Design a binder for this molecule. Structure first.
Ligand code: ZN
Length: 662
């Protein structure tokens, strides 16, 4: 009996029969060796545990589909009039799991060990060997594209004074959850500590979180997790902690408030799902590794200005870039807060690190800010040409000139144009992040001429901030006419002030997936038309295979347009093996989750739509403008405009192939 003398293991007990379908039967020592939470008898997420167990035995995470056979329900029960506390069991529900032999069978082509291994053994996918399950092996899932880099070797350090870090936040009174006292005489500190710690203002059992305190403008969660065998593993062990303490902190946080919480990054899928749900509630989120960290894997996440929004569309492009660069030494980072400003001056005279030109596709000089930029930095126009909806980095002596090309509204329908405008701004943001640009001078794209005789200030500005909230840069908007400056200042003052919540429900739903409105998954638990995460493999549904294949095609053809062309081929037949041959090189075992909401129109290319088309063996397909294709024409593919679009970053978030750490 593995559960002997353990008061909170219901999560493990609940997994037991699901593990059985895969031939896995864990002993008590094995449970303890795998989960510190089990060994220390603490509450935990059965789902997170299942992901960890899958990686440990099969060397891949749950997006592989290995446990996605719908057999045994895994059901979470919140406390209610019947149940004093939340509980995990196998009672009936729409969420089910079990070992999928079909998935294992297709996997056995590259990983024969699946077919040849015995039951209940840990698989080494590379060497092809097996062993009794061990927490020290299969440390990274081979099928995952990591959102950010990991540290090669764990090194502990002596932390500096935390006061230097807390002083970077403008708030006087701070709620502090920490195991060790924090000295900040310049602050008023309420100190919450775990149970055995003397000198604290409050003590709770932090494995269970903490009940609501008063509300603060700054909450600082300093609670860490013990390193064992690997960075990825540390993220795994920390994930439930991160969610629990973050959730408790949300009860203690005022609107417009800031939450700083210690993390190791979000390397594992669960950590990323959590950080994403959490991030959806804030205007901005960044990261820092100040001098007060105790190890090289420690990373403080900074969530700024809580409005607890529902429909906010968050993508980890920015955060991935930041965290990864910090771990690789390329960046600082630290918690000073980016800001917007306006200048009525000539942009050519800007003092900001980079200046953005409002450009045209041909990269030629023209009237506008572009006149000033050409006269002062002519050689930046040597090769400036870039397509509409994109931006190109060039340098003239000591200055970065980014040529961003907005849409001409006379030449495009309003929805498609809007998408292009947003994309130009996102590209500016991509460059700012990639080059760690500290300040940027930028005009309002498509408001001068390309505006087509109408006033685009509000919408151009909205695209600007939508994109540039996703950087760490200080932004200076240069403009035009005193009246336009008046209006921009007004909009910015409105935006910077968050005095109240947009919703009062503070739960962090890390499972929820945001789906297209015409999806047949509408109404199903775990999916929503109005909110949730923007990427999924749809494992556990019939769209999983379609999702995996789209993902792989994107791995084989990193260029968005070449990728979508091959996807068109795939919709029409040609299967996968053929496309893999069409690719010159070694395949990566890993991919990234396809976006679930590329557009709102009827042609949106979801794993769902791909599956419906391919299962109907259509002789032709229609593709909208939100699924970019090569400029030439493709047989049996009709190109049409997208009538309703989405404004978040369309690119695959940057990643590190897990294979690197394997
Ligand atoms: Zn569309």
């Amino acid at each position: 009996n593995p559960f002997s003398c353990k008061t909170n293991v219901c999560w493990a007990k609940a997994l037991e029969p699901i593990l059985a379908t895969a031939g896995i039967v864990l002993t008590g020592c094995q449970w303890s060796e795998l989960f510190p939470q089990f060994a220390d008898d603490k509450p935990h997420s059965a789902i997170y545990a299942l992901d960890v167990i899958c990686i440990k035995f099969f060397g891949m995470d749950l997006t592989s589909g290995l446990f996605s056979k719908q057999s045994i329900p895994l059901t979470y029960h919140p406390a209610d009039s019947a149940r004093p506390v939340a509980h995990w069991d196998n009672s009936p529900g729409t969420r089910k799991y079990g070992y999928d032999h079909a998935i294992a069978a297709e996997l056995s082509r590259r990983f024969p060990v699946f077919q040849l291994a015995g039951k209940g053994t840990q698989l080494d996918l590379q060497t092809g060997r097996t062993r009794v399950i061990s927490a020290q092996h299969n440390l990274v899932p081979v099928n995952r594209n990591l959102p950010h880099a990991l540290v090669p070797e764990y090194k502990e350090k002596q932390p500096g004074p935390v006061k230097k870090f807390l002083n970077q936040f403008k708030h006087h009174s701070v709620l502090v959850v920490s195991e060790e006292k924090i000295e900040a005489p310049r602050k008023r500190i309420e100190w919450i500590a775990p149970i055995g710690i003397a000198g604290a203002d409050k003590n709770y059992n932090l494995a269970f979180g903490f009940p609501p305190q008063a509300r603060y403008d700054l909450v600082f969660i300093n609670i860490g997790t013990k390193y064992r065998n690997h960075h990825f593993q540390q993220c795994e062990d920390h994930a439930a902690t991160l969610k629990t303490l973050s959730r408790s902190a949300l009860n203690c946080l005022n609107p417009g408030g800031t939450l700083v919480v210690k993390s190791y990054g979000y390397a594992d899928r669960n950590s990323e799902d959590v950080v994403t749900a959490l991030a959806r509630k804030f205007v901005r989120v960044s990261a820092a590794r100040p001098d007060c960290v105790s190890s090289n894997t420690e990373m403080y996440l900074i969530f700024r200005q809580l409005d607890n929004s529902r429909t906010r569309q968050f993508t980890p492009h920015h955060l991935n870039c930041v965290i990864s660069s910090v771990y690789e030494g390329t960046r600082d980072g630290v918690g000073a807060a980016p800001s917007y400003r306006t200048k009525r001056e000539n942009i050519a005279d800007c003092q900001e690190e980079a200046v953005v030109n409002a450009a045209n596709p041909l990269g030629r000089p023209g009237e506008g800010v572009c006149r000033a930029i050409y006269k002062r930095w002519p050689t930046s126009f040597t090769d400036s040409a870039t397509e509409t909806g994109t931006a190109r980095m060039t340098v003239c002596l000591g200055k970065k000139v980014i040529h961003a090309v907005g849409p001409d509204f006379r030449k495009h329908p309003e929805a498609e144009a809007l998408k292009l405008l947003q994309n130009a701004y996102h590209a500016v943001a991509d460059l700012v992040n990639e080059h760690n640009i500290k300040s940027v001078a930028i005009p309002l794209l498509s408001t001068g001429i390309y505006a087509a005789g109408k006033d685009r200030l509000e919408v151009s500005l909205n695209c600007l901030t939508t994109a540039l909230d996703r950087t760490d840069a200080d932004v200076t908007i240069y403009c035009l006419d005193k009246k336009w400056k008046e209006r921009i200042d007004a909009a910015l003052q409105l935006k910077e002030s968050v005095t109240e919540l947009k919703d009062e429900d503070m739960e962090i739903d890390d499972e929820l997936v945001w789906i297209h409105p015409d999806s047949c998954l509408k109404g199903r638990k775990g999916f929503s038309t109005t909110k949730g995460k923007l990427y999924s493999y749809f494992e556990g549904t019939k769209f999983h295979q379609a999702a995996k294949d789209m993902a792989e095609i994107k791995v084989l053809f990193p260029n968005d347009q070449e990728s979508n062309e091959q996807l068109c081929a795939y919709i029409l037949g040609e299967t996968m093996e053929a496309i893999r041959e069409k690719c010159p090189v070694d395949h990566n075992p890993s991919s990234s989750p396809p976006k679930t909401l590329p557009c709102l129109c009827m042609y949106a290319m979801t794993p769902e739509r791909v599956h419906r088309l391919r299962s109907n063996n259509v002789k032709e397909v229609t593709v909208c403008s939100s699924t970019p294709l090569p400029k030439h024409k493709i047989k049996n593919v009709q190109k049409v405009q997208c009538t309703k679009v989405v404004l978040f970053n369309p690119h695959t978030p940057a990643f590190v192939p897990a294979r690197k750490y394997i």
